[PDB]
Ligand binder design. Structure first.
Ligand SMILES: CC(=O)N[C@@H]1[C@@H](O[C@H](C)C(=O)O)[C@H](O[C@@H]2O[C@H](CO)[C@@H](O[C@@H]3O[C@H](CO)[C@@H](O)[C@H](O[C@H](C)C(=O)O)[C@H]3NC(C)=O)[C@H](O)[C@H]2NC(C)=O)[C@@H](CO)O[C@H]1O
Length: 129
């Protein structure tokens, strides 16, 4: 599914992500836009042979099993495929872990380089939140 800017904002909120660990809702919609273009079916292979999965592009080297990344710790205890379904529940749940765990949202190269320090509130303008 390809979420609407506002529709996703709404959903991430409902899922308790607004201010989770101190990141405004906007920080999340932003990361997701540039990470996956609000498309949950998105995947991308990295050089190291891991693959990125979902709306938030969670990695298989650490967070989830897709059964063809070897070093693989599956800290999320989810098969990667799960992260691609139209309910974002599993992705949030896992994204929460990723972000708690030390580097905050820096863990998302995209967020860091294109989101960090821009007025991210602009992503949730218009929204009935
Ligand atoms: C080309 C590129 O930049 N790819 C991006 C992914 O990062 C590498 C560079 C890749 O895809 O080839 C990126 O995914 C992010 O990867 C890093 C590295 O594996 C993850 O950070 C590690 O996280 C664990 C646990 O949090 C730490 O133990 C590692 O130790 C560091 C040093 C730390 O001290 O925290 C972390 N590595 C480093 C060196 O920081 C990120 O968690 C991971 N991000 C996500 C989303 O899970 C993805 C994501 O946007 O994007 C590719 O483009």
């Amino acid at each position: 599914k390809v979420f609407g800017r506002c529709e996703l904002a709404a959903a991430m909120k409902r899922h308790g992500l607004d201010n989770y660990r101190g990141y405004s809702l906007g920080n999340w919609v932003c990361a997701a836009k540039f990470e996956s273009n609000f498309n949950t079916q998105a995947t991308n292979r990295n050089t190291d042979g891991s693959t990125d999965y979902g709306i938030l592009q969670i990695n298989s080297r650490w967070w989830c099993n897709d059964g063809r990344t070897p070093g693989s710790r599956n800290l999320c205890n989810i098969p990667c495929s799960a992260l691609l379904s139209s309910d974002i529940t599993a992705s949030v749940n896992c994204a929460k872990k990723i972000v708690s765990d030390g580097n905050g949202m820096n863990a998302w190269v995209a967020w860091r380089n294109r989101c960090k320090g821009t007025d991210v509130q602009a992503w949730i303008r218009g929204c009935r939140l």
